[PDB]
Nucleic acid binder design. Structure first.
Lengths: 118, 60, 179, 135, 49
RNA sequence: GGCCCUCGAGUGCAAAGGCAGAAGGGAGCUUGACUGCAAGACCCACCCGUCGAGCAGGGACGAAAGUCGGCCUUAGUGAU
RNA sequence: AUUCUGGUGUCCUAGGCGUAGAGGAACCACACCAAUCCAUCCCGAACUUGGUGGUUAAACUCUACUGCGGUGACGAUACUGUAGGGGAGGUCCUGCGGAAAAAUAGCUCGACGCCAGGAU
């Protein structure tokens, strides 16, 4: 189940990473605690990060750890908040190995409507 | 007479003439099996006289 | 709720921990799925009795089988499928335990000359199958309305290892054994 | 006639016989053995005829082994015919033997008799062989 | 076929033909498990004395 | 149904070179098997052949980044 | 500044298996249910959605040994660039220059970069 998921990551990554100028938005998902970060063009460092593990909105969040639609919608504004703070308009949105449906899609929705048009 | 090249005209730019910028039917000649796909082809394609992306009707 | 499944999770969970001495409760050997195969050869020609056999097994539980197709028969046709064979159910969840124990109570009294199932008939790594020459063992079947008398088998798929674990699992389950 | 059994391809090149035979230098089975010095193309008729003549002088006991098996074919063209127009059919099969290679092994007879035997087996072959004891 | 594989700065065509996109010198890198790549790198300063 | 080497399978058609979550096997939607071109190379006696970044328009598929001017590649062909 | 766990590479079998032990404070995974979003060529196995009451057993992470896998010399030897020589028997020998494969000693149970979160 996890074994098959890294395949899903690698398939998309090796197709996505191949073309240059890659300010890519890398989302994560888990049974508890949802995470997301933006990565360099040359793949060295990461520009902006956001998660329910972080101290800011985790105390504002209601649900225990934070894999659900509501908390993901919150994160989708916070991840787009840091990017425009840094000064980065367009990114390349990555699934990261999760089929594009519910929480990742809800994350994408708040990311689009914020101002971060990818 | 088994696999044949065939005449995909346009349904867009059916045969007109007058007013300098003359219409002149576009065309595409390309191959289908006669036995496999017995009903005539009806592909959509570009036509440079329409400037659009019309339906290219089959005929003979 | 089924008489096995209610008694299984309540009473039968810590019982096998005495014999084998496992660390966690989850690793104590248990049933994952039941696969009710019915691989027919002549059903490539005519599959009306095969369609009836689909309805036969689905009216036991509710869960239906899948229509099986062959690996390689004799055809050039690459774009579309090859030669069909037979039917197979893939049982899981509540319905799995339902079909599991009500096979032993309703169906098995119908099978004559039945001392029991063979005790030393496991694969090696803790899985099992049982074969019946008729698919009219069940309560719902009637031997005049069926098109063809075509036998079958049932594969029990567990998370087990040793040959003592599967046999004792079946014992706890409630299966009439041989010897 | 130790003929190969359905090989890859029918006819093949001559190449040549450079170098000393390094691998077939060692003895496995026998205690005495016949070893080659000059390179040659040894037919199956020559092998069989050596094996027979060596066997005839075993007599009471002692087992003999062969360690060379032909494999390579040779074609003679249709006899009395002009040059060109393809190759011919393979007539006979040959063992490419190089210098310092084991041909025959033998064990289990008195050194008196083995040496006598391999003289005959040397006489049947086309090359300057020699006797070697080691095992 | 792909005896050598396409690297960075380098197109790969319909016939597995490998051609350079940019200036610079050619590089035959080692791919991982028993294969070869080809990338192209421009060169910084080229002195003449 | 489980176990074990794992790419010895397959890849419409001879062979060679290739192809792992693939170029192999399945599904959804379609027609880029498209017009206007083309920096630049390979191959060569000539005739011929081959690869093509990119731009222009108008589309396809996707959430997007992107990928598509026929086929995994080399045969399936004739000048005037 | 240092060390962990979660994400991303450089580097691709000195980096992979096996064996032996160890980790749940965090992070990570297995177990609860599924009107609905959505799904099964059947099946909430998987995808998805809603919850948490268990667990470090499996996976994953980390520390060990060389049992395998892998890498691997020096020396020699084959072979060969070039200048010569012997044999009619089909190849061999010499000077000058380059030098394997195999085998063995031995070397390996990763290295190193950045970011997120925790601890000194």
């Amino acid at each position: 189940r996890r074994e098959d998921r890294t395949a899903r990551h690698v398939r998309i990554r090796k197709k996505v990473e191949g073309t240059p100028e890659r300010p890519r938005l890398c989302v994560f998902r888990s049974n508890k605690h949802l995470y997301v970060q933006v990565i360099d063009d040359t793949k060295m460092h990461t520009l902006a990060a956001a998660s329910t593990m972080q101290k800011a909105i985790s105390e504002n969040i209601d649900y225990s750890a934070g894999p659900t639609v509501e908390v993901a919608q919150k994160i989708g504004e916070m991840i787009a908040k840091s990017c425009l703070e840094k000064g980065i308009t367009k990114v390349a949105f990555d699934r990261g190995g999760y089929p594009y449906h519910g929480r990742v899609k809800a994350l994408a929705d708040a990311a689009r409507e914020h101002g971060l048009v990818f | 007479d088994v696999r044949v090249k065939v005449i995909l005209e346009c349904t867009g730019c059916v045969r007109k003439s007058v007013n300098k910028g003359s219409r002149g039917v576009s065309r595409y000649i390309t191959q289908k099996n006669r036995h496999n796909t017995p009903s005539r082809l009806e592909l959509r394609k570009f036509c440079p006289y329409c400037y659009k992306h019309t339906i290219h009707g089959e005929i003979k | 709720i089924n008489r096995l499944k209610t008694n299984y999770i309540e009473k039968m969970v810590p019982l096998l921990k005495e014999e084998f001495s496992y660390s966690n409760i989850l690793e104590v050997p248990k049933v994952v799925k039941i696969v009710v195969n019915c691989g027919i050869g002549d059903a490539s020609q005519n599959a009306k009795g095969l369609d009836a056999a689909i309805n036969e097994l689905a009216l036991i539980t509710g869960q239906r089988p899948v229509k099986t197709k062959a690996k390689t028969s004799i055809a050039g046709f690459k774009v579309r499928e090859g030669m069909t064979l037979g039917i197979a159910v893939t049982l899981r969840g509540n319905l799995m335990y339902s079909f599991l124990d009500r096979l032993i109570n309703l169906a098995l009294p119908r099978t004559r000359d039945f001392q029991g199932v063979n005790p030393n008939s496991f694969d090696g790594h803790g899985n099992y199958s049982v074969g019946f020459r008729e698919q009219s063992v069940f309560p719902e079947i009637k031997p005049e309305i069926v098109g063809k008398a075509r036998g079958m088998d049932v594969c029990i798929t567990t998370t087990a290892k040793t040959d003592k674990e599967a046999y004792k699992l079946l014992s706890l389950m409630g299966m009439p054994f041989r010897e | 006639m130790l003929s190969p059994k359905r090989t890859r391809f029918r006819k093949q090149h001559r190449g040549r016989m450079k170098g000393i035979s390094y691998r077939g230098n060692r003895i496995c089975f026998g205690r005495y053995a016949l070893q080659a010095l000059e390179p040659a193309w040894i037919t199956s008729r020559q092998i069989e005829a050596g094996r027979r003549a060596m066997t005839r002088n075993a007599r009471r006991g002692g087992k003999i082994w062969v360690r060379i098996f032909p494999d390579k074919p040779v074609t003679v063209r249709p006899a009395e015919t002009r040059m060109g127009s393809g190759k011919g059919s393979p007539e006979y099969w040959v063992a490419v033997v190089k210098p310092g290679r084991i041909l025959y092994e033998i064990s289990g007879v008195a050194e008196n008799i083995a040496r006598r035997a391999v003289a005959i087996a040397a006489s049947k072959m086309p090359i300057r062989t020699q006797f070697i004891i080691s095992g | 076929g792909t005896k050598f594989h396409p690297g960075k700065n380098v197109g790969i065509g319909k016939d597995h033909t490998i051609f350079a996109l940019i200036d610079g010198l050619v590089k035959f890198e080692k791919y991982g498990p028993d294969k070869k790549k080809v990338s192209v790198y421009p060169r910084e300063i080229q002195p003449e004395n």
